[PDB]
Each structure stands twice: as structure tokens, then as C-alpha cells.
Amino acid sequence: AEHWIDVRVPEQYQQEHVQGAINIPLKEVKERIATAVPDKNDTVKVYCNAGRQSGQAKEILSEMGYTHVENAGGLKDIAMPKVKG
Template sequence: MRSLAAAALLFSTTLFAGEAEITAAVDALQSPETVLIDVRTEAEFAEGALDGAENISYEHIAEQITTLAPDKDTTIVLYCRSGRRSGIALDSLRALGYTHVINAGGYKELKDALELQD
């Protein structure tokens, strides 16, 4: 019974953490200085992307980030399809010393949240 309760708590905490990241991303994107990066493949990006997003694959973010954000204090919002690849990219950027990086999760969820903002 305890393991069931622990699993439910972990699941609900994960849900709220995801909501908090999307809220933080939407708030950050109100600033024109925020860099929005889609870490999906070029093919996924071509099928649809958020306005103003740059496309850098999560596999190449460490090599290419300085072209978009040379200042490590720049606010960066990352998204992919589900949040997994943007999470990997977030870890890469934090390892490089970037301090204001937000994993907004999935494209559809972030798109929906931004549309609600309008």
C-alpha cells in the first residue's frame, strides 16, 4: 500500500513540475531577449514549429549554442516532442555553465499554453 501511495505522489509531483516548467517558459517568452530552441529533428521542425524558434538538434546543442546565446546568463527555453530530448539538451547546457535554461517539454503543450496566453 505504501508503494502505491509513493507512486501516486511521485506521479502528481511530476505533473506539477511539468506545469511549472511550461508556466516558466511562457513567462520567459514574454521577453524578446529569451532564446527559443526547438531540439527536434529538421524534419519535425519543418512539419511545424513555434514562431521565433531556432532549430538545433539536441545532439548538437553543445557545439552550436554559442551562435545563439554567447552569454551564459541568457534565458533559453527548450522544447521537443515530449520533453525527453529537451531535458537532455538542458543537461548539456547546464554542464556548459548556462544558468537560465527552461525545459518547456513538448511542442504541442507549449504551443497550446502560448495560444491561451494570446
């Protein structure tokens, strides 16, 4: 399976995000990715403004032992539709 998780800061998620995703900001991801994605084998697609929070989330998630995290891109570059908070 997979999940789309925006990891930018929560105030920036609300501006506009890829449709049908959830938001777990980089700041909060540690406390909560385990609740949103309880099985590590699941495919975690991460994005944000400009990829950073995703690249960073990818490091800590690999360390937490998720083996299938992928930076989908950044908000802009991702060709998928978007909706606003």
C-alpha cells in the same frame, strides 16, 4: 532576454514548431548553442516533441555552464501558435 530553441531532430522541427523560435537539434546543440546564445546568463527556453530532447539538452547545457535553461514543455502542450517548415 530569452530565446525559444526547438531541440528535436531537424527533420521533425520542419514538420511544425513554435513560431518565432530557432532550431538547434540535440545532436548539433553542443557545436552551436554557443553561437546562438553567446551569453550564458540569457534565458534559454527549450522544447521538442515530448520534452526529451529538451530535458537532455538541459543536462548538457547546465554542464556547459548555462544557468537559465528551462524546458518550456513539448510542441503539443505549449499553448503558443505554430508554423511549419
